A paper describes a structure:
YH-53 is a peptidomimetic inhibitor that effectively inhibits the action of M pro in [name]-[name]-2 in enzymatic and cellular antiviral assays [ 26‒ 29] . As a covalent inhibitor, YH-53 primarily utilizes the benzothiazole moiety as a warhead, and it is derived from a tetrapeptide inhibitor by the addition of a trifluoromethyl ketone fraction. In the present study, we determine the crystal structures of a benzothiazole-based inhibitor, YH-53, bound to M pro mutants from [name]-[name]-2 variants of concern (VOCs) or variants of interest (VOIs), including K90R (Beta, B.1.351), G15S (Lambda, C.37), Y54C (Delta, AY.4), M49I (Omicron, BA.5) and [name] (Omicron, B.1.1.529). The structures show that the benzothiazole group in YH-53 forms a C-S covalent bond with the sulfur atom of catalytic residue Cys145 in [name]-[name]-2 M pro mutants. Structural analysis reveals the key molecular determinants necessary for interaction and illustrates the binding mode of YH-53 to these mutant M pros. The results provided structural insights for understanding the precise inhibition mechanism of the inhibitor against different M pros and strongly indicated the potential of YH-53 to be developed as a broad-spectrum drug candidate.
Numbering used by the authors:
A (entry chain B): 2 to 300
B (entry chain A): 3 to 300
The structure:
Amino acid sequence: GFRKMAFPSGKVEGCMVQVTCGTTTLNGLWLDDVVYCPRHVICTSEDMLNPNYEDLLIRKSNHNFLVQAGNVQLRVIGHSMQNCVLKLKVDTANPKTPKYKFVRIQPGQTFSVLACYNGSPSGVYQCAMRHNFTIKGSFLNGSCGSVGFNIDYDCVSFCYMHHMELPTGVHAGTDLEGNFYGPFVDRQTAQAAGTDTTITVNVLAWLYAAVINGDRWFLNRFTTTLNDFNLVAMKYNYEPLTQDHVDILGPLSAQTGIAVLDMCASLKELLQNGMNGRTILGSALLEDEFTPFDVVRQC
Amino acid sequence: FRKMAFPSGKVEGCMVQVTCGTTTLNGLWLDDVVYCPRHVICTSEDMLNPNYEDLLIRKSNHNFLVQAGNVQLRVIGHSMQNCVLKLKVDTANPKTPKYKFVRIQPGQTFSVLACYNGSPSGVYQCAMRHNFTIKGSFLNGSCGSVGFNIDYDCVSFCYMHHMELPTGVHAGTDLEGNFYGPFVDRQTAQAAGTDTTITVNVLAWLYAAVINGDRWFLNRFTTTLNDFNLVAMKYNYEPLTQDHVDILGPLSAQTGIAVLDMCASLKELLQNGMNGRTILGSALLEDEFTPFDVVRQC
Ligand SMILES: COc1cccc2[nH]c(C(=O)N[C@@H](CC(C)C)C(=O)N[C@@H](C[C@@H]3CCNC3=O)C(=O)c3nc4ccccc4s3)cc12
Ligand SMILES: COc1cccc2[nH]c(C(=O)N[C@@H](CC(C)C)C(=O)N[C@@H](C[C@@H]3CCNC3=O)C(=O)c3nc4ccccc4s3)cc12
């Protein structure tokens, strides 16, 4: 009764285009008369290991950039670079531009990813920004420039553009100002992320989700203080729960009548005892990619 | 591997609302027809056991409020086909995609665009269980939301939502109004059949594991199809059909592991267990990725 649920992607699909420079092709986002895309579209295989991006860009001319919106070619009439993003001014404004904002999200927040190849949308799914600033996505060769977003009353808040797959199989990218999430760099190197701690407030939100959907087996008659919970949480590489997190869980607490610290005592038991093979909402593991908002929005 | 829905835009452009009285359901606007669940015509005391034919005779075109947003589409004809109502409207939808109506087989996955008051709310992947239910996420007001697959810009509509069973799973029809499974559209508690594990999808999952280099479970045995099906039934696994064997063909060729050899490997896993080992990082076998999903992702 509770599923990972993406936002409808139509407003973003109408913005996806193809950007080609030489032998490199990736995806771009076309809003008004500007196409946003990863700047390493200008790199050849020789440039990848140590690209001096300003020195490479100054050598390019507008006509070196081939931008295709479906079948139609869009004429590039100017370009600028903002951090790791290239902004191509085109001679045609996108008639399907939605109301939109660029936002930089916080670890723990979720967004929808529209995975695209050759400027054509392929799939949509939810992702969470993890505490080490990676996301557990599904991206293949040619996916760069795919974007992540949230939608609120027909306004699309773009928060992610895709750049990289780490050796561990997780993914890294930038906001739409071209600043990476995390300590990653847009060069062709094998990069490791920091320690990935679990998003505690999201696990708790999902335990409330299970209760709303009629499952209570993991509850117990005990309680805990906030600091005693956090001591155990940190022992298991969970993020410490703040009073802001407790406040954010209030509505789910009030809906279910289970105090936040009572659910923390439930999670403490699950961490110390395991699930003993049983499952929660279909999962054999503690799910941490639903926010309190995601639970309320869906329930 | 992620559960990935199809991009929903081509379907968003077809969602409308249909109101009769105070009852508002979602509808699907393709060319100059709107399709919706027929019980939009029901009142509260009509729903325990509706006489839909007698209820429809008391309706006229002007009793139906069809809206795209707040814009009314005038109804110029109406008819009933199984459990769906077809309203002819005076405007052909300019956003109509290339489309087909398909009746899917159990095990197959599709994308659901959940909608409320004609307004799309979220999208997610579902598998049709072998008892013809789906594990969806649907609230009051969701009926008429549709499920679909997209192949080369052609939208194949396969599901329209009608019901939540007492067990919390969901049931509905194809776009010709024929229920999947033994369910009926009235306000009554109905039971599904046994929910078997989707064998063909577990086999697809095993192929995905082999593709990614996780192949400890491959054995040196083979089986006949009939011997496997008789064993599978004892573990609440669905018997394989010839169609299942054939849709595993591409993965079998990709890996060089014959379908029946993979069946013998799964049979061993069912009879002896995983014994603490994992496959693609999980101790549980996934049964909601189809052979197509695995190729679409690998
Ligand atoms: C020895 O180097 C490694 C060692 C160990 C792991 C590694 N990972 C990467 C790495 O990710 N590189 C970046 C590109 C860098 C420059 C940001 C990259 O290929 N992005 C992809 C999406 C990738 C591809 C597979 N699925 C993922 O999502 C993308 O679409 C782009 N393709 C190109 C092709 C040509 C020019 C620009 C781009 S941008 C390198 C690497
Ligand atoms: C004693 O009766 C029960 C006992 C035990 C379990 C039960 N389940 C149902 C049952 O499902 N009824 C159908 C309706 C029937 C007629 C197909 C129904 O409410 N469909 C919903 C989607 C539901 C709602 C909750 N989330 C689900 O997906 C839908 O959208 C529709 N709403 C209306 C409202 C007014 C008129 C038409 C429609 S059609 C009844 C029932």
